Amino acid sequence: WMLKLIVKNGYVIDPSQNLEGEFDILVENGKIKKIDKNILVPEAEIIDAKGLIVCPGFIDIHVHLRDPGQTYKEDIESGSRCAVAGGFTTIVCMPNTNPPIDNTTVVNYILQKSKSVGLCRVLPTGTITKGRKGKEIADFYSLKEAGCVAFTDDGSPVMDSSVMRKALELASQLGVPIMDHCAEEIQIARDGILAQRTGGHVHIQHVSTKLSLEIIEFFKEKGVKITCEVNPNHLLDRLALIEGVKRGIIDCFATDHAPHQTMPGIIGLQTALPSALELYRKGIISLKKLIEMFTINPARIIGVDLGTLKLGSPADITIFDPNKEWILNEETNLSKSRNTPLWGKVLKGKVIYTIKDGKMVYKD
Numbered sequence: 001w002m003l004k005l006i007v008k009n010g011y012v013i014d015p016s017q018n019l020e021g022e023f024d025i026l027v028e029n030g031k032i033k034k035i036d037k038n039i040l041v042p043e044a045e046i047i048d049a050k051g052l053i054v055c056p057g058f059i060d061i062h063v064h065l066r067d068p069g070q071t072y073k074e075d076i077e078s079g080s081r082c083a084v085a086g087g088f089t090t091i092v093c094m095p096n097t098n099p100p101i102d103n104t105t106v107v108n109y110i111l112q113k114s115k116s117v118g119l120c121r122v123l124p125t126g127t128i129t130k131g132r133k134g135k136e137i138a139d140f141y142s143l144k145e146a147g148c149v150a151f152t153d154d155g156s157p158v159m160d161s162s163v164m165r166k167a168l169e170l171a172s173q174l175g176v177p178i179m180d181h182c183a184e185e186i187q188i189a190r191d192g193i194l195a196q197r198t199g200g201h202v203h204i205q206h207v208s209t210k211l212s213l214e215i216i217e218f219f220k221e222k223g224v225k226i227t228c229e230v231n232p233n234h235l236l237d238r239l240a241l242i243e244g245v246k247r248g249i250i251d252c253f254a255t256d257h258a259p260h261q262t263m264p265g266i267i268g269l270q271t272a273l274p275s276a277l278e279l280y281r282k283g284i285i286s287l288k289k290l291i292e293m294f295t296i297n298p299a300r301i302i303g304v305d306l307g308t309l310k311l312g313s314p315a316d317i318t319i320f321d322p323n324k325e326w327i328l329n330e331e332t333n334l335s336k337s338r339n340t341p342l343w344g345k346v347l348k349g350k351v352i353y354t355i356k357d358g359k360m361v362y363k364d
């Protein structure tokens, strides 16, 4: 019983409030109490953030934790460690587990494990159809109760377009997004059209071409509730994506953390920041927009009240040094897996502290 914390001398950025400056942050009882220059109060621990950047906890809305089912490739505990070392305080896990997340029993398991491991907030998703088999519509009502924040069959074989349509009707009544993909243009246009028709929110999880981006942009100016994402690790035409980021058509970064233990792709959580900071060192995006795309943008997509430092919010805070050089290898790698071309290379930009609910959950 001794729990005020002050984060001092940092450079604070919070896009949601349009706050940027040399401020201090006072944290009382798990919540943000005050942002202001020059703070000192009795009975509080001081974190000295001189020379560091202080912003809302990162949120990643595209993670595979392989739990239950494949816990040798990765599991809730390792994933969680990976996420906080990566600056993430909330992650959304996909439902291609075994068994799949199509009933309250699995949802309930993932939350309980999550609370025990203690490190970051794990939000589950439910599948679109039972057993992800493709035929029948799952019970979106009960799965939303249990905690699911979105629905997706994660590749897939959807491709029956009437199913996809029932889903967006139901989703729309429930105020939760459907997540699709993992031919691309045909799919994306279909999704756009069904979204417009039903008024449901669809979120596209993979876009690889200029034409795909232009389609999304089109439906956006029509006021279609459609968003999309890109994995910053991928980014180093593979060149319209970079433009798509420049022009703000791509809403957020997400790693699509995909551990394997021998199409398929790559683990991500630990390198997302030093990867994305490459885009800033190239003047391609400002630092505020980079933080935006890890914080308030993904928060808005899954409709949770996070990714801000508004007074009263939960104290979810990432503190990072954008100039610190490190290497991902056995020494530093907190994944059970090592599948990433970035392995062994020199990264630039590292998280020094991650704070969740006013409590320090990672330290360098």
Ligand SMILES: [Zn+2]
Binding pocket: 062, 064, 094, 154, 182, 256
């Ligand atoms: Zn995925």
